[PDB]
């Protein structure tokens, strides 16, 4: 089950800190590893979750804002070359 993965890979936290870093405040190998770990039917869904889970190091996150968390946790499959390589998050 993908929450039983996403708990397992350190709750993708090397990409909630990318997430982070692209969403106005080597990381990102930390990230397509962890995220690699995570089987290819569940990334969409642990990547939501770690988009979710970023918000709570982050202070006040405007919907703005946690819309463009989405949107960068959307590019990082294919930015790991990853399948889905994109998630829609709908
Ligand atoms: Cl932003
Ligand atoms: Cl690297």
Not at 25 to 39: A, H
């Amino acid at each position: 089950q993908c929450r039983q993965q996403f708990q397992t890979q350190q709750r993708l936290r090397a990409c909630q800190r990318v997430i982070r870093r692209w969403s106005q405040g080597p990381t990102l190998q930390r990230c397509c590893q962890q995220l690699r770990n995570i089987s290819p039917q569940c990334r969409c869904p642990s990547l939501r979750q770690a988009v979710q889970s970023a918000q709570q190091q982050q202070g006040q996150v405007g919907p703005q804002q946690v819309g463009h968390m989405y949107r960068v946790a959307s590019r990082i499959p294919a930015i790991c070359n990853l399948r889905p390589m994109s998630c829609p998050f709908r």
